[PDB]
Amino acid sequence: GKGRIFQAAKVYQRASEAAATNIVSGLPPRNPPLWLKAIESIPPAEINTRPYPIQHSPPNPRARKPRNLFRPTKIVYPEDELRRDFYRDHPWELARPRMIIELDGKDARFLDWSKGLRQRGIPLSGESVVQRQLWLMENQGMTKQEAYDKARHEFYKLRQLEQMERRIAVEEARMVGGYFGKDLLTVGMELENKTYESWKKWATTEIARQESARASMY
Amino acid sequence: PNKPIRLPPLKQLRVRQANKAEENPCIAVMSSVLACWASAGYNSAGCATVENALRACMDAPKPAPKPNNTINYHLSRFQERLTQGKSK
Amino acid sequence: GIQQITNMCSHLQNASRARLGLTSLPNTKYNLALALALHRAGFISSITRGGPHPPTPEALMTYEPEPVTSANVATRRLWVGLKYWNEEPVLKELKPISKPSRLVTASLEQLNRVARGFPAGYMKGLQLGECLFVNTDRGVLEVREAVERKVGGLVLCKVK
Amino acid sequence: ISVRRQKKLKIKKKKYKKLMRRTRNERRKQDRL
Amino acid sequence: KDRKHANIRRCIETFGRHITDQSLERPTPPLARGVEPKPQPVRAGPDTGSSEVQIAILTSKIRALSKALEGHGGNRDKNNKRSLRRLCHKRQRLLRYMERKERGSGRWHHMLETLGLTPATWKGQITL
RNA sequence: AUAGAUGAGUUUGGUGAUGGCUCUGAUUGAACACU
RNA sequence: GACUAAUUACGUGCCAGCAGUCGCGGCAAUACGUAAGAGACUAGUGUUAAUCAUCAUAAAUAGGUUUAAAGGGUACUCAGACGGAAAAAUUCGCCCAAAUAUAGGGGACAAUUUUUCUAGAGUUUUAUGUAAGAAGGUCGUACUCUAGAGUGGAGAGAUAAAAUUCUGUGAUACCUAGGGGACGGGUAAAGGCGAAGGCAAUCUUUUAUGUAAAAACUGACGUCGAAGGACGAAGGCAAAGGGAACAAAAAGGAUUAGAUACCCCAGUAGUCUUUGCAGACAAUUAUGAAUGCCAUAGGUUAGAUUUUUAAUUUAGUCUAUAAAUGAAAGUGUAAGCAUUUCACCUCAAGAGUAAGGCGGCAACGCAGGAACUGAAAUCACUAGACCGUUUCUGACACCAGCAAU
RNA sequence: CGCGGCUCUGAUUAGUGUUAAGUCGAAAUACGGUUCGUGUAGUGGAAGUUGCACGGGACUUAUCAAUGUUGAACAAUACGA
Ligand SMILES: [K+]
Ligand SMILES: [K+]
Ligand SMILES: [K+]
Ligand SMILES: [K+]
Ligand SMILES: [K+]
Ligand SMILES: [K+]
Ligand SMILES: [K+]
Ligand SMILES: [K+]
Ligand SMILES: [K+]
Ligand SMILES: [K+]
Ligand SMILES: [Mg+2]
Ligand SMILES: [Mg+2]
Ligand SMILES: [Mg+2]
Ligand SMILES: [Mg+2]
Ligand SMILES: [Mg+2]
Ligand SMILES: [Mg+2]
Ligand SMILES: [Mg+2]
Ligand SMILES: [Mg+2]
Ligand SMILES: [Mg+2]
Ligand SMILES: [Mg+2]
Ligand SMILES: [Mg+2]
Ligand SMILES: [Mg+2]
Ligand SMILES: [Mg+2]
Ligand SMILES: [Mg+2]
Ligand SMILES: [Mg+2]
Ligand SMILES: [Mg+2]
Ligand SMILES: [Mg+2]
Ligand SMILES: [Mg+2]
Ligand SMILES: [Mg+2]
Ligand SMILES: [Mg+2]
Ligand SMILES: [Mg+2]
Ligand SMILES: [Mg+2]
Ligand SMILES: [Mg+2]
Ligand SMILES: [Mg+2]
Ligand SMILES: [Mg+2]
Ligand SMILES: [Mg+2]
Ligand SMILES: [Mg+2]
Ligand SMILES: [Mg+2]
Ligand SMILES: [Mg+2]
Ligand SMILES: [Mg+2]
Ligand SMILES: [Mg+2]
Ligand SMILES: [Mg+2]
Ligand SMILES: [Mg+2]
Ligand SMILES: [Mg+2]
Ligand SMILES: [Mg+2]
Ligand SMILES: [Mg+2]
Ligand SMILES: [Mg+2]
Ligand SMILES: [Mg+2]
Ligand SMILES: [Mg+2]
Ligand SMILES: [Mg+2]
Ligand SMILES: [Mg+2]
Ligand SMILES: [Mg+2]
Ligand SMILES: [Mg+2]
Ligand SMILES: [Mg+2]
Ligand SMILES: [Mg+2]
């Protein structure tokens, strides 16, 4: 046994008895620890008792001798199927950065998918399409494909305007004397130069290495 | 083809020769000198350039040692995480 | 068959040793008898027969099992609720006495003596906390329940 | 049984095996094979 | 192998309890005291598990193997000598159980006379 | 019949086991030695 | 002396002696022999012999068998033990409950038996996969033999170094054309198959289990299993083949103080084929078979399901752990918790020996003591030391150089 | 009287136990200096030793030639060990 006998759940019991009587028989027991009375009415919780975990999906009714009865089950929602479908149809939608750092957790209080894709607190992304799709599919009794088409098409129109604003923004800005910094295209090419030059050096060295290594074959 | 196994619990995960072992360079240069003597001959003329190269190494100063490769330290950090665990 | 009780005793030990909340047992007229005895003595929490999967925990006592006909008798199973208190199981040991190789029987005069910490026959006295279950014509009673009823018979198991 | 104690039985079987061979003709004369 | 699975069909069609329930005169065993016959559900498929079918199939396997151990160089096959002693013993446990279960039913005598299963096949110890 | 269940010395460089030997208790239709 | 209540002095000097066990005695002995004291029982006190207990030390109550005594070489199986579900008849077993209890009551359980049930055990649906087995035939790399009035023309092979040895009757080396035997390269893996022993080139033929998924079918038909019988590695015996290679024996050459040996030149049984005998193995997982059950992780083998990408899942196998268990090492699909059954063990040594007996052609196998002699044998771990052990680290320890004996 | 059993004895001969101070080797325990044991068959004054298959109660004692990264510029009221 590489473990050790922990008794952290019985500190009160053991301590309470030790403070019951004095070690010098025939005297009043000295005052107990200051913490003995603090946690008097707060017994520890029960630990190490494997319960039947929550079943997030119907268990196999055919199994006659089921195993892993005390194993937590996987959490699957109806959205999982839809998210997989959409993001497979729009793989480059994953390059759009999405923040999963919750601010206060109260982001699902102002989400009303009956209005449209645009919502308060969340950006326009594939998730908004899925939630909107699920809403139409359930409330409006639409099919998976039908709801997918409608919500998906609204997603496109909102993205088109976003891309049009960028071009018209920079263009109009220069009509009144507006100058900007290095675009992402130019910056990207510059970094390749620094990296390509480093490759030239390495190539030249190894090339010369093989040449010198070829003189020994003869 | 199977994938690399999960190492069993070892006392210490490390590499014996952390830093490469440097081979004395002109020990090869000497081999060439010996080779030429075998084919050409001891008191020949084509051995001058080869013999002079052997004298060049001994005169030249030996290089300095390289900085130690800190690889055993990082292996000790991730030992319990990579393998089954530690044994003692 | 007595082999079922032995399997049941050994299983409840392993289930309590593994600190499990629920435990399954083959649905038989014999196992149920001893289970009710353990429950009537305060060792197990609840008893409910169901299928191969445990019933809804929140509604264990409200769980309404379906009729046990010949179409599903093979899948029925007894679900026992183990009990733990003070970081220690309440059904620690279930050593059996009457094995398939030999059925040990006790008389009323011997049970009276064993119920006060004095050996008698192939049994040993009962100490603090220990309990003995005897199978008689009045069901699977406790040694002290059989002494007040003035009966005896097959000794199933010693519960500590 | 360790190898050290198995060697004590090894020297018992060899001496006996070697004894039966040596005294095989003597036991053949007396019809004691 | 082709014959092996073709003979199994002959045994299921000859000794099948789903075919002998009408061909034989008294297939079922005689009723006991007080016991009255009752209707039972129909078989969803062909009877292939009854002791008659199993004993018949084992007989076909025993003949093929026993006939292969008596051929040229059959003695050299000393590993299948156990396979024959295992089929004869596996057939003995079904005959010994089917004897007291049927207790002289016409369905039990039709198998014996057809397959030639004499009393040595199950009464005592099969020693090979 | 409800008080009735006990150990000690000795293997090893040392420790824990296994396993015998011996002592601790009671006794004899007893013998012998000193009384 | 300690066990075991109770001390000094002198004498003796591994001598004389004491001793139930461990032990004491070799010149200042608490242990021997005297003296005094002390502890204790008491007309009894000690000793010897025996009995019970000590001893769970033959364990029914109540043991144990991986490493310590002790798992059978193997599992098909007669006898024999043991073994499902829901009811019923009988016994009145079991209980009240005795006094070896007339006559009754109670019905959970038990025995015989009857009727139903499908969870154990089986059958069918050509599974997949697979070095279980057997028959009849072949394949190939190398080896070897013969032939070429082959080319070539003095060495070759062996070993740490050599010798014996091969070669001018032409070797080694390089080829050509035939012949002959046994062997199984890669694939290849913690892989797989059989009851085990064991099974690895290939084609056809032939054979019993086993595994997965679905349905259907029989309806407890199950597990273990003394004995008998079957199978059983290498070696060995018998007969007839075969005979390239390897190789006990026999023999030669070296090494060595000596060399049976280890090494080397060669070499017969034997290894192989067919028919029998034989039955011993570290026949091992140092762990009998089978059933019920207990928390995880990482691989892996043959399938199945699926949103076949990757996850669930059945049956195996192997590492590392938890609870636990164990003397500990460790195990952890069990060496755990329980159960069934068979085999086996009861201090060491003598001894797996003797005698009688059975089996066998023989070798030998099965079975299986006692006398004499002991207080110890035995297992795991721990820390050291040692290693013609690994990796290091210091030292005129060594290399090198100078000088000296 | 014969047959069988049993007891004692027997030239001759075998095994084993005990016995510190003898002799001949150096087999095992470290890679014990030829890996050690199991079976079997030979061989040698003796311990030993050889052939054939088998066991690990011996090599899991295992520890990188994948040599280890410009993984998105710079500047600002942003940023500040
Ligand atoms: K001692
Ligand atoms: K054995
Ligand atoms: K020639
Ligand atoms: K047997
Ligand atoms: K020689
Ligand atoms: K697995
Ligand atoms: K003897
Ligand atoms: K010096
Ligand atoms: K040796
Ligand atoms: K020789
Ligand atoms: Mg042993
Ligand atoms: Mg053959
Ligand atoms: Mg020691
Ligand atoms: Mg004292
Ligand atoms: Mg005295
Ligand atoms: Mg004295
Ligand atoms: Mg008196
Ligand atoms: Mg075994
Ligand atoms: Mg045997
Ligand atoms: Mg029974
Ligand atoms: Mg009655
Ligand atoms: Mg009754
Ligand atoms: Mg049905
Ligand atoms: Mg089944
Ligand atoms: Mg196939
Ligand atoms: Mg099949
Ligand atoms: Mg010529
Ligand atoms: Mg050939
Ligand atoms: Mg094997
Ligand atoms: Mg191969
Ligand atoms: Mg298998
Ligand atoms: Mg039926
Ligand atoms: Mg069996
Ligand atoms: Mg053989
Ligand atoms: Mg042979
Ligand atoms: Mg011969
Ligand atoms: Mg040779
Ligand atoms: Mg035989
Ligand atoms: Mg073997
Ligand atoms: Mg057996
Ligand atoms: Mg395997
Ligand atoms: Mg393990
Ligand atoms: Mg145990
Ligand atoms: Mg002995
Ligand atoms: Mg004998
Ligand atoms: Mg024996
Ligand atoms: Mg050590
Ligand atoms: Mg010097
Ligand atoms: Mg001088
Ligand atoms: Mg004599
Ligand atoms: Mg030696
Ligand atoms: Mg050696
Ligand atoms: Mg050997
Ligand atoms: Mg070793
Ligand atoms: Mg080792």
Side-chain angles (χ1 to χ4, degrees):
Chain A
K2 273 184 285 202
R4 301 179 185 181
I5 310 311
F6 271 89
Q7 302 178 11
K10 298 187 172 188
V11 292
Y12 176 78
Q13 183 186 4
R14 300 160 56 206
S16 175
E17 297 174 0
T21 55
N22 199 340
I23 299 177
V24 180
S25 43
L27 286 177
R30 306 196 162 288
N31 300 334
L34 301 175
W35 62 264
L36 195 65
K37 183 165 187 174
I39 64 181
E40 183 189 15
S41 46
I42 308 176
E46 181 171 341
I47 59 171
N48 302 343
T49 304
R50 302 291 295 280
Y52 190 49
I54 304 172
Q55 298 296 317
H56 300 287
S57 198
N60 183 8
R62 300 200 60 217
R64 303 178 65 87
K65 185 169 180 180
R67 298 192 179 191
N68 303 342
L69 289 181
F70 311 100
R71 178 185 298 269
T73 41
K74 289 190 178 63
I75 312 178
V76 297
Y77 301 114
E79 300 94 74
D80 297 2
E81 186 72 355
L82 312 185
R83 291 198 196 92
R84 191 164 50 81
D85 291 1
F86 175 90
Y87 282 95
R88 281 184 187 178
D89 295 354
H90 310 66
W92 279 101
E93 199 68 28
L94 300 168
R96 290 198 62 82
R98 188 143 72 75
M99 304 166 58
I100 63 177
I101 170 168
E102 310 216 31
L103 317 188
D104 63 351
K106 309 172 185 182
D107 67 289
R109 291 187 176 180
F110 323 95
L111 297 181
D112 188 1
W113 299 111
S114 72
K115 307 298 183 175
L117 287 175
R118 296 168 61 191
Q119 290 296 325
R120 166 179 171 188
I122 57 173
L124 177 60
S125 77
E127 183 58 20
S128 60
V129 174
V130 169
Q131 303 289 354
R132 174 57 170 182
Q133 169 174 1
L134 191 63
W135 188 92
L136 297 164
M137 183 160 50
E138 293 180 353
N139 293 25
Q140 291 199 2
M142 285 188 174
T143 70
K144 178 175 175 180
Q145 308 298 352
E146 287 171 348
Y148 184 57
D149 274 359
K150 181 170 183 177
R152 179 171 61 93
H153 279 304
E154 304 178 19
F155 182 70
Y156 298 146
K157 292 171 181 173
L158 291 179
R159 286 292 192 194
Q160 185 176 12
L161 305 176
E162 177 177 327
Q163 293 184 226
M164 289 188 71
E165 284 196 29
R166 292 205 202 89
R167 185 180 55 74
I168 300 172
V170 307
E171 184 177 358
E172 184 179 28
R174 280 163 181 165
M175 301 292 300
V176 288
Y179 47 101
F180 303 85
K182 287 189 186 178
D183 52 68
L184 191 55
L185 282 168
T186 303
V187 171
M189 187 55 55
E190 291 184 2
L191 298 170
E192 286 175 12
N193 293 332
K194 304 171 103 191
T195 300
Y196 170 88
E197 286 188 2
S198 72
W199 171 89
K200 191 180 292 185
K201 290 197 172 188
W202 168 84
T204 292
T205 45
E206 279 206 8
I207 284 295
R209 180 189 176 186
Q210 289 193 350
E211 295 314 322
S212 67
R214 283 164 46 183
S216 83
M217 307 159 167
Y218 321 122
Chain B
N2 311 331
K3 61 180 180 183
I5 63 176
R6 190 177 200 77
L7 281 180
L10 304 166
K11 177 188 170 184
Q12 175 61 32
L13 187 71
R14 70 190 303 278
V15 302
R16 290 166 190 171
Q17 276 193 349
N19 207 6
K20 293 181 179 178
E22 203 292 335
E23 282 147 301
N24 181 1
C26 37
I27 290 290
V29 173
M30 182 185 64
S31 308
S32 65
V33 169
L34 296 167
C36 293
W37 286 339
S39 69
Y42 307 120
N43 314 66
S44 161
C47 289
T49 182
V50 197
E51 284 180 347
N52 274 325
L54 178 55
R55 296 191 190 94
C57 177
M58 309 316 304
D59 193 308
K62 309 174 281 301
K66 312 182 306 302
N68 306 103
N69 180 8
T70 62
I71 178 173
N72 287 330
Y73 162 74
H74 299 279
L75 291 173
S76 71
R77 279 169 44 193
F78 302 98
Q79 177 168 358
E80 289 191 1
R81 285 175 273 187
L82 293 170
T83 78
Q84 304 268 32
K86 272 207 221 292
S87 79
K88 190 211 90 183
Chain C
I2 183 63
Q3 191 186 28
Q4 296 185 355
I5 295 301
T6 305
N7 289 343
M8 179 180 171
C9 286
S10 315
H11 177 53
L12 290 175
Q13 289 197 31
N14 309 3
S16 294
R17 173 162 57 109
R19 306 301 187 88
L20 301 177
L22 294 176
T23 313
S24 172
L25 292 167
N27 181 23
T28 67
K29 172 183 183 180
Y30 213 154
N31 290 13
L32 179 60
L34 174 57
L36 298 173
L38 298 171
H39 180 277
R40 183 166 52 258
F43 287 104
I44 60 180
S45 185
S46 317
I47 308 163
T48 50
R49 72 153 59 91
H53 300 280
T56 55
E58 70 280 40
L60 182 61
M61 187 139 290
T62 307
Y63 177 74
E64 184 271 336
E66 56 174 341
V68 174
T69 60
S70 72
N72 61 1
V73 66
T75 65
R76 300 308 86 184
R77 226 158 159 75
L78 287 164
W79 288 98
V80 178
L82 300 184
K83 234 170 176 180
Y84 307 84
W85 178 254
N86 196 19
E87 312 298 339
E88 208 77 359
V90 189
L91 192 48
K92 209 178 293 186
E93 269 206 270
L94 257 169
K95 174 178 180 181
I97 301 177
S98 297
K99 314 174 193 183
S101 60
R102 169 171 56 201
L103 296 182
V104 175
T105 301
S107 70
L108 172 58
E109 195 277 342
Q110 287 184 338
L111 293 179
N112 281 334
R113 188 174 170 82
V114 169
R116 283 134 201 169
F118 283 95
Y122 276 26
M123 299 166 287
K124 302 183 178 180
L126 283 183
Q127 317 301 351
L128 169 56
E130 294 179 15
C131 160
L132 190 77
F133 287 103
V134 182
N135 186 18
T136 73
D137 48 357
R138 319 305 307 171
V140 177
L141 309 173
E142 207 219 311
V143 59
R144 273 174 285 272
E145 296 178 1
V147 155
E148 77 179 20
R149 297 201 184 285
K150 301 195 174 186
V151 293
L154 195 68
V155 182
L156 294 184
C157 60
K158 177 177 25 186
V159 181
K160 179 199 161 208
Chain D
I1 192 177
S2 46
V3 172
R4 192 191 98 265
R5 302 173 57 203
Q6 179 57 40
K7 287 178 64 53
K8 292 185 173 183
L9 312 174
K10 182 186 182 61
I11 300 171
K12 289 173 196 187
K13 191 162 181 172
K14 184 63 177 183
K15 301 288 283 189
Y16 178 78
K17 192 75 165 64
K18 188 183 176 190
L19 170 57
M20 302 302 291
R21 301 174 189 169
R22 164 155 50 88
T23 75
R24 191 198 165 188
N25 271 255
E26 291 86 299
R27 294 183 295 99
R28 172 178 162 80
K29 277 177 61 167
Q30 309 170 3
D31 282 87
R32 301 187 57 74
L33 294 174
Chain E
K1 257 196 77 84
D2 299 30
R3 305 166 212 156
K4 180 187 168 185
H5 297 286
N7 301 9
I8 289 167
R9 280 194 285 170
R10 294 184 62 209
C11 294
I12 292 161
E13 293 167 358
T14 306
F15 308 94
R17 200 169 282 192
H18 69 288
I19 288 167
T20 62
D21 279 0
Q22 306 153 16
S23 72
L24 304 179
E25 299 182 6
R26 294 176 173 179
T28 76
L31 306 176
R33 155 181 283 271
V35 176
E36 298 194 11
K38 303 197 298 183
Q40 290 192 344
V42 304
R43 287 155 189 155
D47 168 71
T48 64
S50 50
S51 296
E52 312 105 24
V53 178
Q54 300 197 37
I55 293 162
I57 293 166
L58 288 167
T59 297
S60 66
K61 292 178 183 171
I62 289 167
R63 177 160 188 80
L65 176 55
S66 69
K67 184 177 172 185
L69 297 174
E70 300 174 2
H72 170 78
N75 52 306
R76 301 168 207 175
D77 182 8
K78 298 214 163 193
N79 212 149
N80 279 306
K81 218 168 180 175
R82 160 168 190 276
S83 303
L84 183 67
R85 188 180 62 245
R86 196 175 192 179
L87 293 161
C88 294
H89 281 151
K90 171 59 173 177
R91 180 180 62 172
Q92 163 176 53
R93 293 187 282 121
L94 297 152
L95 275 164
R96 168 161 47 200
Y97 155 83
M98 198 201 154
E99 177 181 347
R100 68 163 207 274
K101 185 67 178 178
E102 304 297 327
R103 48 180 158 89
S105 80
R107 173 175 56 200
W108 150 265
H109 286 94
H110 160 81
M111 176 190 68
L112 295 179
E113 65 192 353
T114 307
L115 296 171
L117 296 168
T118 59
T121 53
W122 75 90
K123 269 179 209 150
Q125 160 147 223
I126 297 164
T127 285
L128 313 173

